A paper describes a structure:
The structure of VACV E2 comprises two folded domains: an N-terminal annular (ring) domain spanning residues 1–454 and C-terminal compact globular (head) domain spanning residues 455–732. The final five amino acids of E2 (FKSSK) and all residues of the cloning tag were not visible in electron density and are presumed disordered. E2 is primarily α-helical, with only three short β-sheets being evident at the apex of the head domain. The N-terminal ring domain of VACV E2 is particularly striking, forming a central aperture that is 2.3 nm (23 Å) wide at its narrowest point. The central aperture is too narrow to accommodate actin filaments (~6 nm diameter) or microtubules (~25 nm diameter), suggesting that the ring domain does not encircle cytoskeletal elements to promote VACV EV transport during infection. The head domain does share weak homology to protein and glycan kinase domains, and to the bacterial SidJ pseudokinase domain that possesses glutamylase activity. However, the overall structural correspondence is low, with less than half of the domain structurally aligned, and key kinase catalytic motifs such as the glycine-rich loop and catalytic lysine and aspartic acid residues are not conserved. While VACV E2 is an acidic protein (theoretical isoelectric point 5.43) the head domain possesses a large basic patch on its surface. Given the functional role of E2 in associating with IEVs comprised of EVs surrounded by trans-Golgi/early endosomal derived membranes, which are defined in part by their specific complement of phosphoinositides, it is tempting to speculate that the basic patch on the surface of the E2 head domain acts as a membrane recognition motif. Other noteworthy features of E2 include N-terminal acetylation of the initiator methionine, which was verified by mass spectrometry, and the presence of a disulphide bond between Cys residues 496 and 535 in the head domain despite having included reducing agent (1 mM DTT) in the SEC purification buffer.
Efficient release of enveloped virions, which promote systemic spread of infection within hosts, requires the VACV protein E2 but the molecular basis of E2 function remains unclear and E2 lacks sequence homology to any well-characterised family of proteins. We solved the crystal structure of VACV E2 to 2.3 Å resolution, revealing that it comprises two domains with novel folds: an N-terminal annular (ring) domain and a C-terminal globular (head) domain. E2 also associates with KLC, binding to the unstructured C-terminal tail present on a subset of KLC isoforms. E2 and F12 function as a complex and both are essential for IEV egress.
Numbering used by the authors: 1 to 732
Amino acid sequence: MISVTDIRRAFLDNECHTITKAFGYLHEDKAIALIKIGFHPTYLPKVLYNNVVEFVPEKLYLFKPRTVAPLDLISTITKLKNVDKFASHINYHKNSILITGDKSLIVKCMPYMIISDDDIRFIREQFVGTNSIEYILSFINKESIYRMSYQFSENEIVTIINRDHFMYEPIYEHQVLDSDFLKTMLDRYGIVPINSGIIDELCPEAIIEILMAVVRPRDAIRFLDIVNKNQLTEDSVKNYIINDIRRGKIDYYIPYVEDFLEDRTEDLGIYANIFFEDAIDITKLDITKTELEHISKYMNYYTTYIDHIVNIILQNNYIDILASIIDYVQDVLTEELCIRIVCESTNPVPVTSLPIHSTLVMVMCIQMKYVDIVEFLDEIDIDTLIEKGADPITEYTFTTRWYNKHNDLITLYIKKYGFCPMMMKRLMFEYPLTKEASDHLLKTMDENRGAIMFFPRTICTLPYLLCCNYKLIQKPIPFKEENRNIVYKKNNRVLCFDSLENSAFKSLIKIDSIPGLKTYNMKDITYEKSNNIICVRFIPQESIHNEERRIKLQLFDIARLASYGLYYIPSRYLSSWTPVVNMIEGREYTNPQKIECLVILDLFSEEFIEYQNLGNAVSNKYELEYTISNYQAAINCLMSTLLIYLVLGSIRSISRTENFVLSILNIFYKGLKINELLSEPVSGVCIELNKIKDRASSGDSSFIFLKKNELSKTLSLCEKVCVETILDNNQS
């Protein structure tokens, strides 16, 4: 459990109403320490302003913009790369920032400043004679344009659209543009010319093509309005719009239909009533499932016929359609139907939209992993929820008032997250707790110190172990004298490096010193130098012919290298998958959307990085918001490699998937020198894996596509292997 002694002392001895207020009564030294690591309220009292400016300036945004001094603000954001959090400060002090005349400063601040016609006059004054005017203005935001009278020149508009393509949207509805300029922007940037500057009469084909290309409904409306002022609308255009309405594209055309298609309501059929109140009696029409899907978003126009529609839905078992109109059928929903919806619908419905909150409905929502199970507490007590397997501590719950209505939910929040600084920060500071709720929270955490509240399941979960802030101990490399009968390639290989300090060079040499590797072996290493450059000549191990054996033996080597402090970032397979970050922040995580390879390459192709530099390499490779430790980066690399070797390895495997998962994960243990065998149930994992295996033959693509939440059991097994990796490391 996170310690709360000091902040609870502050909360009680000053009779605060919120933990935010109590934070301000901490000793300035403790407050500043907490502020540095991000454990702070959303704002700070003025007494701390000088300490923040001196000791942690990047956190000045925690003061009201009026409280911050323009010099302090400008000194801070000059140093920072990301100033998103200073947006309201930057806007409030825009005049101070303009007066500086600093090109780099102004350009960094433009996306957050609401720029006025006067401000534009100041920029053209301070920068006349330089390339900078069209450069500075190219960083303007859509908010400035909406409130602006100024009109961009064409050069400005190009510079702006080169910097951010979709800035054409505010520009195109801000000002009248030359019609040849609109054509040039279409031929060259593919921008659809939706602007009042359209002057030439367009052929029926041209109108149909522009409609087929627009995406936002407001652009279709605008286009048609402009065009109708230039020319009459053809029967060819009218026909396409009716057929587009039949394809579900409705919002695009509501003004148009109401003004020009009044005499085509029989062609519009069931859709006509969206445009003309009760225009067609739909009971006399043959209604298709597709037509009901399209009008589901438009049911407020079919309330005259709501019974007929509901009846078609129930008679044809259109449960997804029933779910999509659930707000209109509250009176019809029996417990039986409520259950059907929960089990059969593609996407969940809100528990508040189910009028029946029986235990039976609740266990179906638990089975379907509904995120809003807490809403059954109007009928069912928290103990029955927990006994029946509910987890009400979700993101959904945080958007409700339930934490103030029920101190048992705050206790459950602590049991799930009391060790997790980011999640406790969120409840302590970013949730509108009551005095009594705030008191219960700090009391419960203070009287349950240590690990007792997380025993015996949570203390052995990966997120819990990531927040103990352990270390992975590296083992020293044993003496090597290679006696094995290794088959080497009949050709040598040369790798060159800019210097001998090169970390990749240093790890290649270290890996050569490591005994007992199965795939990463090298013969007859010679050196050649040219000033700083160092080249390594060597004869690589011949590749293992059996692909399944090769993949198993590569994971052994990965485990053995990790035990000695050498890791690799699997970014060629999972370019953005950092589940460790989710875990230490208390956020749920799921599988990546794809594996960017089909073939597991040999380990010679990867760059192995020292543990001591791993936190920095991982955070840079994945462009993380903040730098994670070497420990947490090591866990991410293992989690990534395990997922890749299980999924990709399965695909290329010829043995029974149950024996593959069990033997390659035991192979991983052996590389770690863990003497106990892995013995986990893999039946549920193998069903997930075999599904993906079957798409990989049918797909025929350059990547392996993974469906959302398809690998939950495989991920819990990757987690369990990492947990055992950490616990065994901590015994040594």
